[PDB]
Symmetry: C3
Subunit: 233 residues, 3 copies
């Protein structure tokens, strides 16, 4: 019955969202638990790669709209943590989204906060909060243009339209498409593969790819150079 649970298999930690009646929507306490799970993952020396997976046939419907306006609603912190929980956490290690069913609104934002996205053939991603007038305040306006280009990003943001798996893959919004029911396993396999590689190197390259955004090239290249030292140590 816990909204969030964590299962580990060697160096891959799977963080699991489970709110069957709420289509894995995330309220205040669920957000805090998601944040706690990723903070533990980040600090855990034995954990190399995480997987974020929604249980029971869907990924995440976004913020819990029933709970908004109540004591259980998402917390609104100007400098973070983000309303969905970990959406402003800059992890030292990668996370793979394992998406079944719907990843919409705050749920697409959690997907986008992950480093890679594995989706099932019938899954749907979208900015559905467009319909409701609830703004993207879990990084969607920053990550969508950077992940897939401003043009496509503006399409998804302005229209709020659904994006199915084949289009999602074609435009780079997701990285793998697998059969129905297979997302968790495919993501965990991918995570295990990334975890088998030399880890300080994975982390130096990842951290640089993320940090370079918004930097002038010379400055970005000076930072990238620091990876040598990271992997010597």
């Amino acid at each position: 019955q816990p909204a969030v649970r964590v299962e580990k298999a060697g160096p891959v930690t799977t963080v699991i969202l489970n709110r069957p009646h709420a289509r894995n929507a995330v309220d205040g306490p669920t957000a805090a638990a998601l944040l706690a799970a990723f903070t533990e993952f980040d600090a855990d020396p034995e954990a190399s790669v995480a997987v974020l997976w929604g249980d029971n046939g869907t990924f995440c419907a976004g913020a819990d709209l029933k709970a908004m306006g109540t004591d259980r609603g998402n917390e609104l912190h100007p400098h973070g943590p983000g309303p969905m929980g970990p959406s402003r956490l800059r992890l030292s290690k990668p996370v793979i989204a394992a998406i079944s069913g719907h990843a919409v609104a705050g749920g697409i934002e959690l997907a986008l906060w992950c480093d890679l996205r594995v989706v099932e053939e019938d899954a749907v991603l979208g900015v559905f909060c467009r319909r409701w007038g609830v703004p993207l305040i879990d990084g969607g306006t920053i990550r969508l243009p950077r992940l897939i280009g401003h043009s496509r990003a503006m399409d998804l943001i302005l229209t709020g339209r659904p994006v199915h798996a084949n289009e999602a893959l074609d435009i780079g919004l997701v990285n793998r498409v697998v059969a129905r029911g297979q997302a968790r396993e495919a993501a965990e396999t991918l995570a295990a593969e990334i975890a088998a590689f030399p880890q300080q190197c994975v982390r130096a390259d990842r951290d640089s790819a993320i940090a370079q955004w918004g930097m002038a090239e010379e400055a970005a290249l000076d930072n990238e150079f620091g990876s040598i030292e990271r992997v010597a140590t």
Copy 2:
């Protein structure tokens, strides 16, 4: 036969370029009129989404090469407005390009300045000014890479080659492809769809998506959080529905 005219249909404002002899090329006075049309749109509280449409079977051929070297030539302002007119204006509300025929040179730049692009199946986009030796000075060198990625932007910019609708859609250069004759209508329908959503929320998300470019992620996320206060009145007005 005014070069620029404006037609409104509820909350959608259509800005129409019409210079049949010049294939909708934009000289100085036309640029000023385009700028004024969009300035008016920006200030009109009843107007939610604009459509930029070229009349008589084409979008825009670029800056008017025939007006070059005359007092009808495009104006060159170091800090704006841009030569094509509205190309350095940051509108508070979105614009959709409705592209028939050609969107080339300064004309592809107008298309890129819009938020979304709907093109007809036989239309052609391109940095044709490459052949002419006329530089991109209406944001093309900035918006092409950010819109479709640096690699494809370099292809289009270096070669100046034509891009047909098929390829344009595949690479994200355009967002919708429709049948010949249908761009204005399809763009207007898409515009009405966007205008039917809660608008302060639309504008908050759009403004952040535009502004985050070049910012460090933390500062960008701090700015994005501002959207809560932007929609506060509108969320309350809609509290019943919600």
Copy 3:
């Protein structure tokens, strides 16, 4: 037998990497020769576009792993030049990658440093250094996300996987795919096409497309406006 040579045909300069026993891997001395070749190109007023081509059926396998840990290894300079040689050089004129065989590790970074990439249909690109535990330190972490978007870049970087030509084209990692053995010719043809346009204007647009990254839009636009002055002489030359 020289590791690097240079051949010119009119305004197109082809820089050729040839280390057939080492799969065109780049050690310290080869890197220095690649840098010198591109430095010469950059200063050559008659050279308009460069082509980077690997001889003998492959492009470049990255840093020479056998030279690594010796005094022939790549040099490590905090502020440049880059270990592969020219990878931190911001050239005043464009370069086209002509890829056969493999462009991996440092080799994919040289490909990404070029402006355009023409690849052979059986060619393979990849971040193979992921397996080796050697970091991307020739701009791959910067150029990959900017070139094809953050999502696809993270795929390639984290997994280190091989990307074939068809996928490469589809995702914008390469710009043209041609038949086996034809990358050099196809790149030289494309280079000559680009060389035939007015060049000050090409260079103004290119420099602005590069410089704008990281800049706020407004500052980027102010910089872009400078292209008018850059082309002033050329515009008059072409006036009538």
